[PDB]
Structure formats: structure tokens, C-alpha cells
Amino acid sequence: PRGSHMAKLMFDSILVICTGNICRSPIGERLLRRLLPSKKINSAGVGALVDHAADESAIRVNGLCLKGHRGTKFTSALARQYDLLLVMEYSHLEQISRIAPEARGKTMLFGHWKEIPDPYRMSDEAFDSVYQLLEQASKRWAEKLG
Ligand code: NI
After folding, report:
1. Among the four residues 67, 77, 99, 133, which has the most C-beta atoms within 10 Å?
2. How far is the CA of 71 from the centre of ligand 1 (A)?
3. How far is the CA of 124 from the centre of ligand 1 (A)?
4. Which interval of the chain is the signal sequence (predicted)?
């Protein structure tokens, strides 16, 4: 979990997790990717829309592209491939413990330095407020990991 130059040794892979894997986690993944170019950053959804491209609204919103993103179901097998798991909603943690018991010990909230709301099927203003949350949350994580 901490706390400096040591963090770079402990976490080289990060799994960003939301519900549908077409709004929140796609954005968070891309944000962390250009902040941590050396790390393995992917995403999944506890109730993902498998093989679905990123949501239209999420795509619209700063200026970063969601290139080649497809919906990915979260599985214990997948958790086994990542040092750190970041979830958007607190409910995800509980659903993670249920799906992958071994992963719970290595999962925290995206924006640990409050949870991020589900923008799915909401106004563009909601996507902006959420995006803002994702960006600043992604920055606090970038510094806390080098
Ligand atoms: Ni479909």
C-alpha cells in the first residue's frame, strides 16, 4: 500500500475495475497508462458488457482516446495477474471478495486519496464530474506509485 520508492517495486501491474467496463474503468485505465507508461494497466467489470466498445458518452470526454477498448468480465483467474486492483464503487470490493477471495487483500478504491459514481445512462455533465474525479484520482495514484 505504501509508501514511496518502495511502491515501484511492489506494484508493476494494475487492474482498474468498474461495473460495465465501458465507462469508469476504461477512462481510469487510460489515465493511469500515460502516467505510468512502464506499468501493466488493464480493466474489467464485475458485471461487464463483454466485447462492447466504450460507451459513447465516455468516449466524448480532457483529450485522451479509448483506443481498442472492449468490455472484459472480471474473474479470479484475471485477478491472479495483477498486483493492484482499483475499484470505483465500494460495492465492488464486496463483489470482489465474493468472486476472488485471494484478490481482496490487494484491492483498494480508485481515488483512495471517495468512491466514483456510475455515469452510465446519464447527462454529459455527470460524465465530466466523474471524469474530473478519475483524473485527480489518477494523479494521486501516480505520485503514490512513483
Ligand atoms: Ni452484446
Report:
1. 133
2. 9
3. 23
4. none
